[PDB]
Design a protein around this ligand. Sequence first.
Ligand code: FAD
Ligand code: N01
Length: 531
Amino acid sequence: QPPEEVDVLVVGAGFSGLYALYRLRELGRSVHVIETAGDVGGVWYWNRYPGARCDIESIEYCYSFSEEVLQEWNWTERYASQPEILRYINFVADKFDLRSGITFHTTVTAAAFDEATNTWTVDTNHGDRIRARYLIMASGQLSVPQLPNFPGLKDFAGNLYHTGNWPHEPVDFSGQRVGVIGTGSSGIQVSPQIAKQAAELFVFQRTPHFAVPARNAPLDPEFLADLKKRYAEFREESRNTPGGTHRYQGPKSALEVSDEELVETLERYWQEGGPDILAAYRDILRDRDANERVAEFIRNKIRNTVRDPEVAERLVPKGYPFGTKKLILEIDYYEMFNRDNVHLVDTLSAPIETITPRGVRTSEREYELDSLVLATGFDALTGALFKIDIRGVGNVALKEKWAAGPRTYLGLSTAGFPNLFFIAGPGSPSALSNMLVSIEQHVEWVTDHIAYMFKNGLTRSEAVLEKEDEWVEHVNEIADETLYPMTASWYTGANVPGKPRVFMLYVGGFHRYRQICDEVAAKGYEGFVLT
Ligand SMILES: Cc1cc2nc3c(=O)[nH]c(=O)nc-3n(C[C@H](O)[C@H](O)[C@H](O)COP(=O)(O)OP(=O)(O)OC[C@H]3O[C@@H](n4cnc5c(N)ncnc54)[C@H](O)[C@@H]3O)c2cc1C
Ligand SMILES: CC(=O)c1ccc[n+]([C@@H]2O[C@H](COP(=O)([O-])OP(=O)([O-])OC[C@H]3O[C@@H](n4cnc5c(N)ncnc54)[C@H](OP(=O)([O-])[O-])[C@@H]3O)[C@@H](O)[C@H]2O)c1
């Protein structure tokens, strides 16, 4: 139940928030968190759908700031399930007594910067008004569920769910005719789970996403114990990579190798599982012909997965470069379509016309359903800020500054909004990275800066408008040497009608981005106006 005056206010208590809280306390600053949720966790509190699971190996997707935590915590599986990750987060929160720094059940609704006093005034739906010198937005990247765009949702007679705001008490689909709309990551995890309770499962595909097998496995406790001996060293290796994990960076071009070496090299990634295929050859993101060679191996893998070819070809991702939507790890998802209580409804060929109260009508036919699950993604990267009335200098709304796309210096800050910091968001590596790496560096960097403002008795930090401008053109130029901008993904805002179609992330790799952030801090925060 919030203070009235705080050195730094933080929004959200997922990985970013909790680290921010801890580190700002270690730095002898007053600090408080405001969080919509009932408890700590962010995505891992929200997304309790059955099947929810990490894409990055447990040993990678975790904090490194605390040596004790590395030592004590025991991961059990190659990819943590959501409850295990939530346990981890609750564990870390207990260990550093973080909850006394967090007001739960409370959404921030506006914030306005008082040029008179170099300070932010932050409002909430409960009615609290807090005044802070610095505002840290740790409100995540995928934290505002997107409904799909059509009519008669309100009308549906059965039960309705978004994966991203799933109920707390487990949901029973036993006996039910169930429909899932969305075959993203969330769709692909949640479906094989639902398929096991329900009498009939209908899967509403628009564009096929690319997925490879996770080959999850138990985590050998010998190996864990071993790794613990050199944990910090291992983490440090992950921090000096483009992607923030131990993925091997293929030195070769997917064009230079023969077909035989191609198939044989990719068959090895396929047996092993996980995302490392993305970096099998250096030019898979940089050259349509390179990418198409990998992409085709994948599609055949998918064809040979499903007994019936008609069904199989509808599962085959067509239209766009492999790796340019999030690459998805599947567990028994394609196998699922062999079960005869599962049906793939292709909405490319037969659009969804409306939801009726009895279910879902396409142009071809209607589908009667007792339950319907939306796995339809999130208003991404900007979604969550946009729900807060954030006003900068001159009373400029950020919602408007950014209306043609996010405009940031390093992603960390935007000009015209002193003392405002975005954690792991547009302008930065963000979700193109093991996010615990992207997130730890940002918190470190932001909180170093705040510590350093206080050390030097300064009170106003602002990004310089031309540097912001130079940063944006830079983010776009590098995006444009890759294949990313070419496709409609949440990365480009394309999953939301009317959202400006810009590739929003920094594609240079984490290591490079940190280097830049470091040279910047080294020079007294070049590109900021400090007063
Ligand atoms: C299902 C799912 C799985 C994921 N898998 C991976 C993965 O495998 N690897 C990876 O690297 N990343 C993945 N991520 C990306 C994910 O964003 C990060 O890994 C990380 O969990 C993000 O944490 P965060 O602190 O940035 O914010 P979030 O965990 O998104 O937390 C933000 C918090 O702020 C709260 N909040 C938002 N607005 C307000 C408001 N106005 N007032 C008060 N509170 C507010 C939200 O409720 C939320 O609690 C996944 C994302 C999803 C959605
Ligand atoms: C770690 C891990 O495995 C994990 C697990 C879960 C999430 N995550 C992370 O969060 C991000 C989101 O993944 P997600 O599943 O929640 O959402 P998505 O990826 O945006 O796909 C939305 C889906 O719904 C379909 N769709 C959208 N609108 C539609 C419409 N109007 N009509 C009909 N269909 C509509 C849309 O169809 P299409 O043709 O591509 O627009 C697509 O099928 C991920 O990338 C990860 O970063 C990670």
